[PDB]
Amino acid sequence: RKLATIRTAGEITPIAGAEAIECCHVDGWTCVIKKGEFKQGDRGVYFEIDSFIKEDNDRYPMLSKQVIDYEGQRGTRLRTARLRGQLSQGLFLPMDRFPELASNQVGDDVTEILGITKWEPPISTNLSGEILGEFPTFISKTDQERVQNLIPQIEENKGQKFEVTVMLDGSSMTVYRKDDHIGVCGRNWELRETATNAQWHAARRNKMIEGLQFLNRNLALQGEIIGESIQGNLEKLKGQDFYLFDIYDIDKAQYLTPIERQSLVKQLNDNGFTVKHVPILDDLELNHTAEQILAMADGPSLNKNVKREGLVFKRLDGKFSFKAISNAYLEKHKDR
Ligand SMILES: Nc1ncnc2c1ncn2[C@@H]1O[C@H](COP(=O)(O)O)[C@@H](O)[C@H]1O
Numbered sequence: 183r184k185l186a187t188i189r190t191a192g193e194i195t196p197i198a199g200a201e202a203i204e205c206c207h208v209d210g211w212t213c214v215i216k217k218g219e220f221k222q223g224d225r226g227v228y229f230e231i232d233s234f235i236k237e238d239n240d241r242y243p244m245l246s247k248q249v250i251d252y253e254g255q256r257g258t259r260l261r262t263a264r265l266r267g268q269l270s271q272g273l274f275l276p277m278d279r280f281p282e283l284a285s286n287q288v289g290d291d292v293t294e295i296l297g298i299t300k301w302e303p304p305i306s307t308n309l310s311g312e313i314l315g316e317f318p319t320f321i322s323k324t325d326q327e328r329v330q331n332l333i334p335q336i337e338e339n340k341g342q343k344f345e346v347t348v349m350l351d352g353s354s355m356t357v358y359r360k361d362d363h364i365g366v367c368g369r370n371w372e373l374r375e376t377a378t379n380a381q382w383h384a385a386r387r388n389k390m391i392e393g394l395q396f397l398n399r400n401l402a403l404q405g406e407i408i409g410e411s412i413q414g415n416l417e418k419l420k421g422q423d424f425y426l427f428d429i430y431d432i433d434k435a436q437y438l439t440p441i442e443r444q445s446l447v448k449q450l451n452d453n454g455f456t457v458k459h460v461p462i463l464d465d466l467e468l469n470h471t472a473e474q475i476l477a478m479a480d481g482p483s484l485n486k487n488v489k490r491e492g493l494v495f496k497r498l499d500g501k502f503s504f505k506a507i508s509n510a511y512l513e514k515h516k517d518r
């Protein structure tokens with residue numbers, strides 16, 4: 183959701199050597215615009231990277247040349263770009279190119295009204311199993327808002343403390359117990375156990391079904407399956423494996439705090455259910471701009487010889503979380 187939102191032109195700074203364009207700051211994003219398209223304070227529809235914008239030469243002539251066939255529809259995937267050393271992310275169009283939003287307000291999500299959908303990398307061949315049912319409605323999914331979209335929330339949380347973990351580039355995976363049922367899920371579906379299903383294999387490998395059966399509580403262990411043939415196997419692992427990053431308390435419909443999650447992992451491991459965790463870095467006391475957070479995102483991954491996709495920050499009360507994706511990672515890996 184909110185691929186296209188009405189946002190406010192922030193600081194507008196010139197681009198040396200290029201006089202037809204200039205650099206516009208939209209929340210935490212930097213977005214290249216045609217010169218004089220906006221002034222600071224102007225409103226416009228901002229389209230985030232990963233938006234897919236169906237072909238339309240009169241509304242989106244600036245995307246005419248990057249049109250591709252994507253799930254049977256012709257349009258443009260909005261990706262990170264660096265053109266003359268200037269980072270550029272997203273599309274920012276003045277409001278008067280959208281006469282049907284004339285009465286909308288700043289901050290409105292105009293995604294459906296504009297027909298924007300989301301581009302996604304092809305999901306891994308062996309992570310597409312047999313579906314057993316919907317993703318359980320009593321378990322939260324694992325979406326993380328971007329630090330770029332959280333400027334006022336980054337300031338209100340000044341002084342709060344955050345668990346910092348490495349963001350692993352795999353697939354979201356959930357293993358849960360609710361009363362007399364234990365299932366294994368992908369990002370969007372609960373799956374059937376088969377000999378080839380990867381999620382089920384990684385859950386049997388670390389005995390985490392037996393772990394939830396030992397703990398006797400309604401919990402969802404949420405983590406990332408990574409490894410061979412999963413999103414290009416950044417970490418160069420052999421085989422595939424699950425790395426926990428969250429535990430959802432189903433009965434209380436809230437996530438466990440980081441210390442609760444580490445205590446629960448401790449008791450699992452200690453009882454012979456060794457479930458690995460995404461790498462944990464130093465707790466961070468928040469006193470930063472989004473630019474500063476974004477600058478932290480680059481670094482070593484689980485495999486400390488590769489550059490990580492980014493970092494995830496989870497407040498110590500478990501009630502506020504976000505991710506910061508490394509823009510170097512986005513400029514190196516075009517399928518992200
Ligand atoms: N350390 C982490 N904490 C939270 N989520 C993570 C972590 N590492 C990887 N992820 C994945 O990153 C996703 C965040 O959104 P996305 O940018 O759509 O991949 C989550 O849904 C998880 O699948």
Ligand SMILES: [Mn+2]
Nearest residue numbers: 350351352353
């Ligand atoms: Mn991901």
